Design an enzyme around this catalytic site. Structure first.
Site, PDB file in Angstrom:
ATOM      1  N   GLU A   1      52.459  29.425  80.193  1.00 26.78           N
ATOM      2  CA  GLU A   1      52.335  28.538  80.837  1.00 26.78           C
ATOM      3  C   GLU A   1      53.421  27.463  80.328  1.00 26.78           C
ATOM      4  OE1 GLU A   1      49.005  25.365  82.528  1.00 26.78           O
ATOM      5  OE2 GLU A   1      48.215  27.263  81.589  1.00 26.78           O
TER       6      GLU A   1
ATOM      7  N   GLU B   1      63.962  29.846  48.463  1.00 25.35           N
ATOM      8  CA  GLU B   1      63.437  29.246  47.222  1.00 25.35           C
ATOM      9  C   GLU B   1      62.177  28.724  47.022  1.00 25.35           C
ATOM     10  OE1 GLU B   1      64.242  24.635  47.370  1.00 25.35           O
ATOM     11  OE2 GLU B   1      63.645  25.858  45.963  1.00 25.35           O
TER      12      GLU B   1
ATOM     13  N   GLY C   1      70.390  26.210  55.599  1.00 25.50           N
ATOM     14  CA  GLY C   1      70.939  27.887  55.703  1.00 25.50           C
ATOM     15  C   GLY C   1      69.899  28.700  55.927  1.00 25.50           C
TER      16      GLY C   1
ATOM     17  N   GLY D   1      66.935  27.624  57.657  1.00 28.55           N
ATOM     18  CA  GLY D   1      66.309  27.459  58.986  1.00 28.55           C
ATOM     19  C   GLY D   1      67.107  27.928  59.793  1.00 28.55           C
TER      20      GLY D   1
HETATM   21  N1  GTP Z   1      62.109  15.814  59.870  1.00 31.37           N
HETATM   22  C1  GTP Z   1      62.539  16.554  58.793  1.00 31.37           C
HETATM   23  N2  GTP Z   1      63.927  17.049  58.427  1.00 31.37           N
HETATM   24  C2  GTP Z   1      64.065  17.716  57.162  1.00 31.37           C
HETATM   25  C3  GTP Z   1      63.279  18.031  56.137  1.00 31.37           C
HETATM   26  N3  GTP Z   1      63.587  18.822  55.345  1.00 31.37           N
HETATM   27  C4  GTP Z   1      65.069  19.049  55.631  1.00 31.37           C
HETATM   28  N4  GTP Z   1      65.090  18.412  56.813  1.00 31.37           N
HETATM   29  C5  GTP Z   1      66.416  18.317  57.552  1.00 31.37           C
HETATM   30  O1  GTP Z   1      67.012  19.809  57.699  1.00 31.37           O
HETATM   31  C6  GTP Z   1      68.224  19.875  57.368  1.00 31.37           C
HETATM   32  C7  GTP Z   1      68.433  20.523  55.673  1.00 31.37           C
HETATM   33  O2  GTP Z   1      67.582  21.995  55.989  1.00 31.37           O
HETATM   34  P1  GTP Z   1      66.498  22.402  55.241  1.00 31.37           P
HETATM   35  O3  GTP Z   1      65.426  22.732  55.889  1.00 31.37           O
HETATM   36  O4  GTP Z   1      66.357  21.263  53.995  1.00 31.37           O
HETATM   37  O5  GTP Z   1      67.272  23.774  54.543  1.00 31.37           O
HETATM   38  P2  GTP Z   1      66.810  25.058  54.210  1.00 31.37           P
HETATM   39  O6  GTP Z   1      66.315  25.745  55.655  1.00 31.37           O
HETATM   40  O7  GTP Z   1      65.595  25.180  53.376  1.00 31.37           O
HETATM   41  O8  GTP Z   1      67.962  26.187  53.849  1.00 31.37           O
HETATM   42  P3  GTP Z   1      68.638  26.216  52.524  1.00 31.37           P
HETATM   43  O9  GTP Z   1      68.341  25.164  51.630  1.00 31.37           O
HETATM   44  O10 GTP Z   1      69.995  26.142  52.873  1.00 31.37           O
HETATM   45  O11 GTP Z   1      68.096  27.402  51.819  1.00 31.37           O
HETATM   46  C8  GTP Z   1      68.686  18.415  57.135  1.00 31.37           C
HETATM   47  O12 GTP Z   1      68.892  17.841  58.509  1.00 31.37           O
HETATM   48  C9  GTP Z   1      67.325  17.641  56.850  1.00 31.37           C
HETATM   49  O13 GTP Z   1      67.458  16.250  57.067  1.00 31.37           O
HETATM   50  C10 GTP Z   1      61.629  17.326  56.601  1.00 31.37           C
HETATM   51  O14 GTP Z   1      60.773  17.849  55.696  1.00 31.37           O
HETATM   52  N5  GTP Z   1      61.503  16.778  57.677  1.00 31.37           N
HETATM   53 MG    MG Z   2      66.078  25.421  50.911  1.00 37.23          MG
END
Ligand code: GTP
Ligand code: MG
Ligand code: ERR
Ligand code: ACP
Ligand code: GDP
Ligand code: CA
Ligand code: CA
Ligand code: CA
Ligand code: CL
Ligand code: MG
Ligand code: MG
Ligand code: MG
EC number: 3.6.5.-
Lengths: 424, 54, 440, 351
Positions: free
Chosen positions: C254, C71, C144, C146
């Site tokens: 390494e 997105e 989802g 990530g």
């Molecule tokens: N440390 C940190 N955690 C993050 C961040 N953004 C999201 N998270 C964590 O990642 C998880 C949510 O995953 P996101 O990365 O937001 O989801 P996405 O990969 O964008 O996938 P969708 O939104 O489902 O399409 C949660 O546990 C968040 O707390 C960030 O900027 N820093």
């Molecule tokens: Mg997202």
């Protein structure tokens, strides 16, 4: 992004009008669709519910449906009546006579394709439609019978969008006719099958609230709709204002609905307001918002277990205090949250408070106690149906008794499904 | 405690200190898996549209 | 010199990627428009910083990075943000509908339609590489995208670049930092399909980073910007040996040689000290002894767990600032006597040490005070399996009732992938317990 | 309102702590696997320490120290004493002990063990031993017997010197052991419970037939079972400290404190200070306490010997009430607020 809103029938259009009046006042947009606010946060998510017009006027992405013209003429006459796209007023002339069968199979069938044409024109103008919300009652004929026919047609044409409803549940304490349990039972089965999330608004609860705690001796539909407006504004905050949580229903649906049929939410609001000045503290907001007396579905949360909860705090306040207080209702009443869904309470915050309050909270519970609502409707249904009372109004539009037997079997199933998870 | 393989440069140093010595699937298999899920989706959608047509 | 491509997937990976590249620019003297005055070889080179930045005829220094989100809103802030000019438009990739916290929607449904475009954009960067070592992959476990898209990307990268190394930086889910209720599901699922495609993976528990920010930075409610600048310091510590002259961890291979003897057990624990608030009026600088000791307090680890109740397989200390070997050995000496540091029998009890004399650089206006010396310890201890125990248990509670499962089957995933993934994790927990426990 | 969960049903002592806590009106018990507790009274085996201290907004406390089993298993304790410089192979209060692995399993000391035996037989020393594990005990002067017997059984065994010259209470010419209850709180304060017990034999000690093990094994189980004279002198074959003190004053002209308790406090302190760096929860995200049972022998020269440490002890029936109230007081309410029965063990000598 975009949501297409539909309001159907008498109750659907009265609550829907006052929803659009309340949120347009929040977003600064005035009755002619002209913006006049002082913050850009009012317009950052304005596209979710509004189209930008010629002259950068804001027009609700709202379609208004009825089988008679009375209520919609009152809307066009109403406070914000002119804000609505006139092409989006779709009405028949005959009414539905509080008859689900007329809404769903005869009178409504005649009108439904023209409603779908306006839907389609609003959908095509959407950069990326995420889905639909419907406001209707389940106890009459148009919002109940045609509303669920529309929900069926819309799913056929857009099977991958989110369908979301605010559904007013009938109650003998605020009752227009005896056939409401029939209309509601028929409607509930459609809702189990064809919506992703349904906000169950019980006219019983709105009455008791207006009476027992707002001290309104003779509550009108106007009083009931004040409560509904405030609650609807609250549950749609993330859809309309900037935040760490973006405006999408799917993610809400994914995190609230562990089993597809159990998507009936018990809403709540705090502080409960009739149309004062005392500061409400964060511990107070939190204790009230979870109070059974602030639930808009006349069920007792202590009779069931919470599958999931979403909570939305509005105003300037300490989220450290918010976090603390949320953690302490769950740590202090851990009995009433299912242990097999870890961390099943989500908390969101929005800096902008509703009109007239510096601090509010909106509660959204997916509790198994909602079965009480469906059992109640089921007992009222069965008391008439065992004598086939008042069925002739329905068989006369083509329906068979079998379809009634099926619908009550479906609702009793839904009730058993709730019970299964309250003991799991 | 032996200090070994010391390397220096202007940016820094590195070395190793020892306290004590010791006592994949195909591209087609992937596109197949992705297509099998896609047909499971298109089936369930056909079941819905068949139900809606009833 | 061999180049490294960074891949940032989903919201977490993108926002952390931005933190990392901001820091890298500050560390190498690269300005937001990509100019590096100190780079005297204009338009080309093979210095150590060139493993991460490429050069253009005009003197622009360009990250070897692709950002990928299903997105647009998160990468749009990159496109319009203070490092807009740093990145080529072709390196910022957005869909329009995200994966809704659903592994299956990111892996199967939305992934199928964007994976080839991403691999093509990844290939454009590989093609300006005289010798590619491989990839650094940033993503959350719980998202989802990530989780689901990353595991698809990891599978394909194994296919299209089979001799290359792949390292991950993976944010592990914590309810204190906004969390979807199905993130345990997403976590187990993406670990299961990524396990054989990843040579080394650094887990960051958002719970540990959150608490470090509250306790040591006096931030009562940390934001993603707070969390990500700290994570970025730790990542920078970990990558500095690929971007700077030295002889420890000079290439990606390494990292696996030095930290991962058993390839499934490829999750080193990172511990970082000191984290000091920039608002701290009076602060007395910590010594080599004090910061090395802080490497064995759980409150400083990226994953809260107890390394005394496990065994070590490897251990590196990366120091930055005023540090000389003899002080490290003196500090190590005193620490071995006062602390439970047990290795597995088949590994030496020893420390690989790397010192870089430039102390950590801090983002202007950040929360971290400048310090004269800091250390990041990378230890491959079996105690990190505590995080898998916690995740698996949460997964077990929900899946016993099949809660939320229907959302995954609806994207075309088969229920059996759940139990497969959970069975793999069952094996992984036992591997850890084999290596790191002797019988009661 | 604090919250707790119970995961050992078969524990006499934490059953009583459970009820004591409910009766406060400020503690509510949750169901076994509800994770939103303040206090875990956990299982004996495989207690999931890795899942503690990760609940936002909940201070969490468990009634067991992770890692404390190295004190509380026979083979472990021996290995801990021989290997830890604070205890040393040159440790004056622990009986000579050797870890012995059965031959099926094939670290193990069994041939450095016979060095000591051969040294002793050629030394004309008293040379009884005892083989034991973590009911299946052999007391013999035949070394060549002892390694026979260990390997018929399938688990690892400890061979320890036998206390041939024990202090014997009169009337009875009879053996005993002393059990002390010590509580280590979350701050690693070490509290000795002021009441111990002597688990007495009711059989006269006979040093020429170790084959019969009822004057040689003071276990409360074996005495209520096999021995003719259970209940004969002391109620339940349990002598308490006021009696044992008076006896020492009349019979031997000393007290319990001087002749025995100083030694006991020194052994307790030394054991727990040794493993403190390995098990302390001082800077940890959850917190531990634990109740231990120490078992000592007294020889005839009034020298105290540690024979074992028990990580999940039961109490003596008369003492349950007072000890359990004391656990709530200093282990639980110390962390969760609503003349002491414990002696704090602290010594700070300068050298
Ligand atoms: N440390 C940190 N955690 C993050 C961040 N953004 C999201 N998270 C964590 O990642 C998880 C949510 O995953 P996101 O990365 O937001 O989801 P996405 O990969 O964008 O996938 P969708 O939104 O489902 O399409 C949660 O546990 C968040 O707390 C960030 O900027 N820093
Ligand atoms: Mg997202
Ligand atoms: C459009 O309306 C809204 C959307 C969201 C929303 C947007 C983006 N992402 C998420 C994620 C969750 C979410 C929901 C429930 C959860 C969890 C974790 C546990 N549980 C029980 C996460 N909600 N959400 C949120 C809202 O308020 C809560 C909205 O208004 C009601
Ligand atoms: N080296 C030794 N010398 C003399 N007596 C010994 C001895 N070792 C054990 N005993 C005797 O054996 C009895 C119990 O042995 P052991 O050490 O196994 O206790 P135990 O674990 O079986 C029951 P508990 O755990 O309650 O103490 C002791 O009470 C003591 O009488
Ligand atoms: N809370 C509220 N309930 C209404 C309103 N109008 C009708 N109801 C209820 O809605 C049911 C009748 O439905 P109605 O909308 O008038 O029928 P329709 O016009 O055929 O769709 C009954 O339960 C009424 O009590 C309203 O404005 N507010
Ligand atoms: Ca007609
Ligand atoms: Ca150059
Ligand atoms: Ca590989
Ligand atoms: Cl290759
Ligand atoms: Mg009406
Ligand atoms: Mg038509
Ligand atoms: Mg024992």
């Amino acid at each position: 992004r975009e949501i297409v809103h539909i309001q159907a029938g008498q109750c659907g259009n009265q609550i829907g009008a006052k929803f659009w009046e309340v949120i347009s006042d929040e977003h600064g947009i005035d009755p002619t669709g002209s913006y006049h606010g002082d913050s850009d946060l009012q317009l950052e998510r304005i596209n979710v519910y509004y189209n930008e017009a010629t002259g950068n006027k804001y027009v609700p992405r709202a379609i208004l449906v009825d089988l008679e013209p009375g209520t919609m003429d009152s809307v066009r006459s109403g406070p914000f009546g002119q804000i609505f796209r006139p092409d989006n007023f779709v009405f028949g002339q005959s009414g539905a006579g509080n008859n689900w069968a007329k809404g769903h199979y005869t009178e409504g069938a005649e009108l439904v394709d023209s409603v779908l044409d306006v839907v389609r024109k609003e959908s095509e103008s959407c950069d990326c439609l995420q889905g639909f919300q419907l406001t209707h009652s389940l106890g009459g004929g148009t919002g109940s019978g045609m509303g669920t026919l529309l929900i069926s047609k819309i799913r056929e044409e857009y099977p991958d969008r989110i369908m979301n409803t605010f559904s007013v549940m009938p109650s003998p304490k605020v009752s227009d006719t005896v056939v409401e349990p029939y209309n509601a039972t028929l409607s509930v089965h459609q809702l189990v099958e064809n919506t992703d999330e349904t906000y169950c608004i019980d006219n019983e609860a709105l009455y008791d609230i207006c009476f027992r705690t707002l001290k309104l001796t003779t509550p009108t539909y106007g009083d009931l709709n004040h409560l509904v407006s405030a609650t609807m504004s609250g549950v749609t905050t993330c859809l309309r204002f900037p935040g760490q949580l973006n405006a999408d229903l799917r993610k809400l649906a994914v995190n609230m609905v562990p089993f597809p049929r159990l998507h009936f939410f018990m809403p709540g609001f705090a502080p409960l307001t009739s149309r004062q000045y005392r500061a409400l503290t964060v511990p107070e907001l939190t204790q009230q918002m979870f109070d059974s007396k602030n639930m808009m579905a006349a069920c007792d949360p202590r009779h069931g277990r919470y599958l999931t909860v979403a909570a939305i705090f509005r105003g300037r306040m300490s989220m450290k205090e918010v976090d603390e207080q949320m953690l302490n209702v769950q740590n202090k009443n851990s009995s009433y949250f299912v242990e097999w869904i870890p961390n099943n309470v989500k908390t969101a915050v929005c800096d902008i408070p509703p009109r007239g309050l510096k601090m509010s909270a909106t509660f959204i519970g997916n509790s198994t106690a909602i079965q009480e609502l469906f059992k109640r409707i089921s007992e009222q249904f069965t008391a008439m149906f065992r004598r086939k009372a008042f069925l002739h109004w329905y068989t006369g539009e083509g329906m068979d008794e079998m379809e009634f037997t099926e619908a009550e079997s479906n609702m009793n199933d839904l009730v058993s499904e709730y019970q299964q998870y309250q003991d799991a | 405690m032996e200090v070994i393989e010391l390397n220096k440069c202007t940016s820094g140093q590195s070395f190793e200190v020892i306290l004590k010595p010791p006592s994949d699937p195909s591209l087609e298999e992937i596109q197949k898996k992705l297509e099998a899920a896609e047909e499971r989706r298109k089936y369930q959608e056909a079941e819905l549209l068949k139900h809606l047509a009833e | 010199m061999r180049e490294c491509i960074s891949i940032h997937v989903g919201q977490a990976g993108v926002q952390i990627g931005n933190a990392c590249w901001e820091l890298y620019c500050l560390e190498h003297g690269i300005q937001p428009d990509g100019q590096m005055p100190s780079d005297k070889t204009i338009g080309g080179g093979d210095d150590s910083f060139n493993t991460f930045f490429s050069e253009t005829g005009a003197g622009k220094h360009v990250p070897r990075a692709v950002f990928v989100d299903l997105e647009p809103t998160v990468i749009d802030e990159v496109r319009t943000g203070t490092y807009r000019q740093l990145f080529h438009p072709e390196q910022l990739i957005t869909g329009k509908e995200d994966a809704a916290n659903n592994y299956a929607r990111g892996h199967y449904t939305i992934g199928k339609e964007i994976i080839d475009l991403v691999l093509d954009r990844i290939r454009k960067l590989a093609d300006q590489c005289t010798g590619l070592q491989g990839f650094l992959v940033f993503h959350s476990f719980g998202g989802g995208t990530g989780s689901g898209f990353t595991s698809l990307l990891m599978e394909r990268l194994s296919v299209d670049y089979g001799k290359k190394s792949k390292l991950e930086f993976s944010i592990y889910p914590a309810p204190q930092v906004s969390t979807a209720v199905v993130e345990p599901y997403n976590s187990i699922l993406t670990t299961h399909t990524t396990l054989e495609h990843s040579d080394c993976a650094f887990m960051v528990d958002n719970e540990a980073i959150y608490d470090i920010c509250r306790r040591n930075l006096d931030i009562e409610r940390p934001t993603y910007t707070n969390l990500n600048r700290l994570i970025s310091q730790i990542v920078s510590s970990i990558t500095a040996s690929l971007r700077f002259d030295g002889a420890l961890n000079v290439d990606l291979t390494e990292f696996q040689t030095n930290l991962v003897p058993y390839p499934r057990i490829h999750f080193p624990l990172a511990t970082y000290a000191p984290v000091i608030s920039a608002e701290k009026a009076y602060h007395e600088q910590l010594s080599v002894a004090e910061i090395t000791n802080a490497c064995f307090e759980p409150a400083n680890q990226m994953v809260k767990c107890d390394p005394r109740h496990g065994k070590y397989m490897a251990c590196c200390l990366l120091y930055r600032g005023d540090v000389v070997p003899k002080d490290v050995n003196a500090a190590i000496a005193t620490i071995k006597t006062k602390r439970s540091i047990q290795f597995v029998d088949w590994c030496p009890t020893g420390f690989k040490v790397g010192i870089n004399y430039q102390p950590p650089t801090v983002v202007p206006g950040g929360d971290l005070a400048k310090v004269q010396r800091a250390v990041c310890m990378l230890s491959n201890t079996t105690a990190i399996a505590e995080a898998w125990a916690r995740l698996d248990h949460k997964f077990d509670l929900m899946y016993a009732k099949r809660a939320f499962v229907h959302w995954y089957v609806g994207e075309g995933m088969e229920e059996g992938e759940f139990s497969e993934a959970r069975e793999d994790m069952a094996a992984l927990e036992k591997d850890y317990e084999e290596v790191g426990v002797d019988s009661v | 309102m604090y919250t707790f969960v119970v995961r050992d049903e078969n524990s006499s002592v934490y059953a009583e702590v459970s009820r004591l806590l409910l009766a406060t009106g400020q503690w509510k018990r949750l169901r076994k696997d509800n994770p939103r507790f303040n206090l875990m009274l956990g299982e004996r085996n495989r207690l999931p320490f890795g899942r503690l201290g990760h609940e936002p907004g909940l201070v969490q406390l468990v009634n067991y120290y992770r890692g404390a089993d190295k004190l509380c298993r026979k083979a472990s304790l021996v290995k801990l004493i021989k290997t830890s410089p604070e205890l040393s192979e040159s440790c004056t209060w622990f009986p000579e002990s050797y870890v012995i692995y059965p031959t099926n399993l094939k670290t193990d000391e069994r041939e450095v063990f016979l060095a000591a035996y051969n040294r002793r037989r050629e030394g004309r020393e008293g040379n009884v031993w005892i083989a034991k594990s973590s009911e299946g005990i052999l007391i013999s002067s035949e070394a060549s017997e002892l390694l026979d017997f260990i390997d018929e059984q399938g688990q690892v065994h400890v061979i320890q010197k036998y206390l041939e010259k024990p202090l014997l209470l009169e009337p009875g010419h009879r053996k005993f052991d002393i059990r002390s209850w010590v509580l280590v709180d979350h701050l690693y304060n070490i509290y000795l419970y002021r009441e111990g017990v002597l688990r007495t034999s009711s059989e006269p000690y006979n040093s020429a037939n170790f084959q019969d093990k009822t004057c040689h094994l003071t276990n409360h189980c074996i005495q209520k079972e096999y021995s003719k004279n259970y209940g004969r002198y002391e109620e339940g074959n349990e002598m308490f400290f006021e009696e044992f003190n008076q006896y020492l004053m009349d019979a031997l002209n000393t007290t319990l404190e001087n002749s025995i308790l100083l030694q006991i406090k020194h052994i307790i302190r030394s054991c727990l200070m040794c493993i403190e760096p390995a098990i302390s929860t001082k800077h940890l995200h959850y917190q531990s306490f634990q109740l231990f049972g120490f078992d000592f022998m007294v020889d005839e020269e009034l020298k105290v010997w540690l024979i074992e440490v028990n990580g999940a002890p039961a109490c003596a029936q008369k003492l349950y009430a007072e000890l359990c109230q004391g656990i709530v007081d200093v282990a639980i309410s110390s962390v969760f607020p609503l003349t002491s029965i414990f002696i704090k063990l602290h010594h700070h000598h300068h050298h």
